[PDB]
Amino acid sequence: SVRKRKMNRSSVGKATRRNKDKQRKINIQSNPIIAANWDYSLTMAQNYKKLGLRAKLQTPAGGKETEVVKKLEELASRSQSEREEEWLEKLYKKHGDDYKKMFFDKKLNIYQQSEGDLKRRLLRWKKRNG
């Protein structure tokens, strides 16, 4: 070759890259419980059977719980705004619990929300307050 002949001849050197070992021994990255329980001497499919978890959901072409309990372990384990709360205080002190009067009201209930909207927000308000 023309260009390769110069690169071998020059005193610049070549951008030598040794990256063939890393193409096989790939570290697991996305789960810490797996990161501890993964034998790199074994293959992909062999590591899955060792754990318990399925490696393939289809019937595979060709031929052929210590860890899974720890995954079930990690499976065992919103408020309202200041204006919204203060606005609900105005409605409750005015009417009480008359939602029909509350939604036919114009001065306090400006955005013409339904009975179901106002009462739901009042239930959340009655949890944080009286």
Binding site: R24, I26, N27, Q29, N31, L53, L57, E74, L75
Partner: protein, 108 residues
């Protein structure tokens, strides 16, 4: 004249590709849960094979939603139709069994 000298090479290529996908998609099983489908044409109708994707109907009957189905790794097809009754039953049972097996991790 092409020669496939790389038959051994490309199997090692494909295996390492699956190995990377295993490393990156750590707890998940590399591929999506595909349906069970009856093949077309008089010659092949006795054969029952892996289909592309389920349906909105099969997904809805299983007890989950279409957009959510894809996030849990169920392949969903929208152009496929549920004409046969036996195929419909077999796929619904396949999903319900799959839903008993899955362990969906929390987002916290």
């Amino acid at each position: 004249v092409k020669v496939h000298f790389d038959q051994a090479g490309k199997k090692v290529s494909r295996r390492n590709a699956r190995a990377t996908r295993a490393a990156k998609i750590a707890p998940r099983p590399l591929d999506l849960l595909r349906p069970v489908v009856r093949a077309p044409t008089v010659k092949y109708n006795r054969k029952v094979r892996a289909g592309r994707g389920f349906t909105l109907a099969e997904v809805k009957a299983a007890g989950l939603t279409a957009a959510y189905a894809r996030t849990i790794g169920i392949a969903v097809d929208h152009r496929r139709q549920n004409r046969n009754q036996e195929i419909f039953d077999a796929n619904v049972q396949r999903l319900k069994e799959y839903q008993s097996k899955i362990i969906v991790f929390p987002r916290n």
